[PDB]
Amino acid sequence: DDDLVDAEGNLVENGGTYYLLPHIWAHGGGIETAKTGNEPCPLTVVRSPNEVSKGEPIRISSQFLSLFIPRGSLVALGFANPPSCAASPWMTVVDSPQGPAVKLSQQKLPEKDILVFKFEKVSHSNIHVYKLLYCQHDEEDVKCDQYIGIHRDRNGNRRLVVTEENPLELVLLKAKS
User: Fold this and answer.
1) Cys-Cys link to 73, which of 48, 62, 144, 157 (CB 3.0-4.6 A)?
2) Which CA distances in Å does 145 have to 53, 132, 163?
3) Which long-range CB contacts under 8 A does 76-81 form with residues at least 24 apart?
């Protein structure tokens, strides 16, 4: 099984909320949302530039009713408290000229569209660190080797998108009740 482990050494609970913090303190803070481009509201998933900030608590769920999450299972990431305008708390990946980007949606999407992430163990580390993989849809299946990284746009928003270098390396801190 080899279940995902959180920042404090305890197994990650399937469906539990966690702050997705960068391994390296300097990289910034937690995950949030921001209104960018032509969006009518905060639909762009970004990383806070402030270290002291833990971002939004994020629910991490697989497609099973298991208590924990085996390392190779696909996961969906949703905000515990999504911005009012999103139809559901779940993140999804949307194509574009710039490339695939993590966004929220104004409509409820099918599971196959939100269960597109996968955490990957970062080797050479004492605390459990994980890269965040994006899993596209080949035929009817899926495949993940594209990593999610950060792209700072013209206004300083550190948008989460698929990048080819400097992928996110997170630790999952358990959010409080």
Assistant:
1) 62
2) 29, 10, 11
3) 76/111, 76/114, 76/115, 76/116, 76/117, 77/20, 77/117, 78/114, 79/33, 79/104, 80/17, 80/56, 80/175, 81/56, 81/57
53, amino acid identity:
S
What is the domain partition of the chain in residue ranges? 1-177
Please state the length of the chain: 177
**φ, ψ for residue 112 (rounded to 5)?**
-55, -20
CA dihedral over 99, 44, 70, 168, signed as positive or negative: positive
CA distances from 55 to 17, 18, 19, 84, 155 (A): 12, 10, 6, 17, 19
3-state secondary structure of 36: coil
Could you write out the DSSP letters of every residue in 77-100?
EEESS--TT-SSSB-EEE--SS--
Between CA 88 and CA 114 the distance in angstroms is 10
What method was applied to determine this entry? X-ray
Measured CA to CA, the distance from residue 77 to residue 91 in angstroms comes to 6
Element (H, E) at 113: helix 111-114
